[PDB]
Design a protein around this ligand. Structure first.
Ligand code: NA
Length: 228
């Protein structure tokens, strides 16, 4: 899958031991289907979020020299019940396995990382360096809102990743609209977005809307404390 590093008997231990954390799916060689697609989606997500996590695959072949059988056997991977998902903590000796009962989904894989490492794969659309300064934005004073607009506008112009540049536009719109009209903007925009999301929409269009809804979520506050 895109971003998934496929490892073998020669590369596995050496590569795992060079990253702070690795998540490895052991499966048949040339895997396919729902769990693999989830692992693919996971690779994409993890990649957008961090550089300290290796996303890797090991394909155990049933043919010829049985490449990677020894590797599978080192970790006692149940080859009657592929795929098997492992998380390694910086070397090939210190690891945890994904319980065999847990469905191999994008959500469950994100959860696996966050339960077993200091790493966090955020929501699609989010930008961590924006989020870290935006807590409680709707409630802070106008001058501090304007300072943050100027700051994140400067950050946006430096953004080199195309998705982050697009997602930054939504952050800025929301920052400006909330500064202009106040927290009522959250409800307005949530209803607009949900009307769209409730229409007949393609998967791509849904993903676009969800990214807007995820960025807008950053602006929700538990309590409105600023005057409207
Ligand atoms: Na931008």
């Amino acid at each position: 899958c895109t971003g998934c590093v496929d490892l073998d008997e020669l590369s596995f231990e050496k590569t795992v031991e060079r990253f702070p954390y690795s998540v490895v799916k052991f499966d048949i060689a040339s895997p396919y289907g729902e769990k693999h697609e989830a692992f693919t989606a996971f690779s994409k997500s993890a990649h957008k979020a961090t550089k300290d996590l290796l996303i890797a695959t090991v394909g155990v072949k049933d043919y010829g020299e049985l490449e990677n059988k020894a590797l599978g056997d080192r970790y006692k991977v149940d080859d009657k019940n592929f795929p098997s998902i492992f998380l390694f903590k910086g070397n090939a000796d210190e690891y945890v396995q994904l319980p065999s009962h847990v469905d191999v989904t994008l959500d469950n894989l994100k959860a696996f990382v966050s339960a077993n490492t200091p790493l966090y794969i955020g929501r699609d659309g989010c930008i961590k360096e924006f989020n870290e300064v935006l807590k409680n934005y709707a409630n802070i004073p106008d001058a501090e809102q304007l300072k943050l607009i100027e700051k994140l506008q400067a950050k946006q112009e430096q953004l080199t990743d195309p998705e982050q540049q697009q997602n930054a536009r939504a952050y800025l719109i929301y920052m400006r609209k909330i500064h202009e009209v106040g927290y009522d903007f959250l409800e307005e925009e949530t209803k607009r977005l949900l009307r769209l999301k409730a229409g007949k929409v393609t998967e791509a269009k849904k993903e676009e809307l969800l990214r807007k809804l995820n960025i807008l979520e950053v602006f929700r506050v538990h309590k409105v404390t600023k005057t409207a």
